[PDB]
Amino acid sequence: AHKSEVAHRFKDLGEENFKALVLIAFAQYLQQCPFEDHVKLVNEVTEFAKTCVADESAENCDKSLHTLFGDKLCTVATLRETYGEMADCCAKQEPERNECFLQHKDDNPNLPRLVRPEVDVMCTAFHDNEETFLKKYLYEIARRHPYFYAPELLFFAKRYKAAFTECCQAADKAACLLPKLDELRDEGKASSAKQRLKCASLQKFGERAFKAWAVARLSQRFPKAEFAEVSKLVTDLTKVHTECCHGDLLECADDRADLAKYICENQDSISSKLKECCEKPLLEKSHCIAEVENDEMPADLPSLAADFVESKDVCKNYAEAKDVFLGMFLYEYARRHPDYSVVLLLRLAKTYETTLEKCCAAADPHECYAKVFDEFKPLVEEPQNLIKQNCELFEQLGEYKFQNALLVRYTKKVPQVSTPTLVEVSRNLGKVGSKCCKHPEAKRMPCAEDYLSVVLNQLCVLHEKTPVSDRVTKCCTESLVNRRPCFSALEVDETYVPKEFNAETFTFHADICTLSEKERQIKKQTALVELVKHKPKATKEQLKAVMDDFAAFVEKCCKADDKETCFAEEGKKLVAASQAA
Ligand SMILES: COc1cc([C@@H]2c3cc4c(cc3[C@@H](O[C@@H]3O[C@@H]5CO[C@@H](c6cccs6)O[C@H]5[C@H](O)[C@H]3O)[C@H]3COC(=O)[C@H]23)OCO4)cc(OC)c1O
């Protein structure tokens, strides 16, 4: 164990990443804090760190990272008149102060939306103070996505700098810059959502859950790798994400680097597909390994019949070490099925487990578990059916109309759920259609069913903040593996009383003419959820009818005699038809 963890981390990560990482740590705890303040605090922490690196025996160098950093956040956070319910945390010591900070993370911060300035402007600000410009990027995303995988956020910042470096010297700056930022925005939302799930698993379902998940995913990725190796990897990788989720961002970054290093110094025993990745700079390398394509599986692997049903020691080995035996089954099953979703593999693993508990406590266990594998079959076919059906539906509806289809279906299921949430979740689910139906009906399952998990988790966590439907609460709390079926099983809420008619939520304005097409869509899908809430018995024929009116008048009013008052009479037409009763 090192004396002075801050020195140890400062030396290991180096100054630039140390600062960026603390800045992320601060913004993911204090999302409402202004930029300038966080930087000042990070600067002071970094000032102090250097003293400990110089001399580890100097005054506070032996304090934990959280004590040191926590004391530092609270200088601005103790302000109750500006931050409210967050010096709740500052009244505490470590570790309870940190436990407090983690539980006050807000998945939906009431934060001002980003202005996006002219390209001229951004590029000016970039050359002027390159370092501030990047911090301002780190800060904005971190406070908006308090679960962004911090090391990966350094990677994003780096791509972000790279974009401005390249495009700000381009002949056409806009034509170069914007697609890169558009890709970066999408890739970032995806990354954030994926990490929320890794964190929710750990924090709500425990380390054992995350491990099973990783064994499964890594086994599919590295099918030539031995179990001992995968287990080692699962271990390191869990230690890393546990750290990140628990707010130990420096150790997380460090331990992820060590890992990325291990992987590359052991390529020949992991995968044949890491060659290019391990030639990249640190951030890029680590990212590349993380998203690397599955290796080819060894040819002619045997069947699992021998070890997991036919051996005489199935019950012994099970009872002799249940977790490593299940890990093995899960490893052996996942290696051989990169075409199964990670969730399917966990279900089969869970089925095999529950089947051994029942059968090892039986007269003749082998006679009892002989069937087991046959029982996996309807579990495998079930996701296949849904994906087949949803992809046909998407193929004839397109992303947008497909999202609206989900918007209506999902609103009727759980109309207490908040409108912006319904809109976000349904729009994202629509993105499975685009991302996954694209693939041949044979790689679709991991893409489709693993991504829904990420999307269903967003719903779960956005709903957790201010819960309004016990049925969502139940599906989200029940298991993690049963989330999709539990949500699929939900029936239309006939118990729910229709919302009254608010005029403003159905009146539009001249500002809508200045929005992107995407925003306009979002604007209208927002109206649609509100429509269903106000008339849940409306028909598909009726709903899509009222839809095209919204569509048509936007067109006519964005052109007409003063666009502002134009949305207004349409507001007056709808208002009069409601008072009418
Ligand atoms: C991870 O990827 C994501 C990126 C973003 C957005 C985002 C989205 C974009 C974009 C730029 C930006 C940047 O926005 C700019 O951030 C700047 C940071 O740099 C500094 C400034 C320099 C000089 C004055 S301010 O200015 C800021 C701009 O105002 C702002 O638009 C990101 C920086 O931090 C964000 O949050 C921002 O071009 C078109 O699409 C949002 C996400 O979800 C909401 C997300 O997941």
From Swiss-Prot:
It comes from the Eukaryota. The record marks K198 as: Aspirin-acetylated lysine. One of its GO terms (cellular component) is extracellular space. Ca(2+) 1 binds at E5, E243, D248, E251. Glycated in diabetic patients. The modification Phosphothreonine is found at T82, T419, T421. Changing R113G: In Yanomama-2. Cu cation binds at H2. The keyword Chaperone does not apply. (4Z,15Z)-bilirubin IXalpha binds at K239. Changing E569K: In Osaka-2/Phnom Phen/albumin B/Verona. Interacts with FCGRT; this interaction regulates ALB homeostasis. Interacts with TASOR. In plasma, occurs in a covalently-linked complex with chromophore-bound alpha-1-microglobulin with molar ratio 1:2 and 1:1; this interaction does not prevent fatty acid binding to ALB. This is Albumin. It comes from Homo sapiens (Human). The gene is ALB.
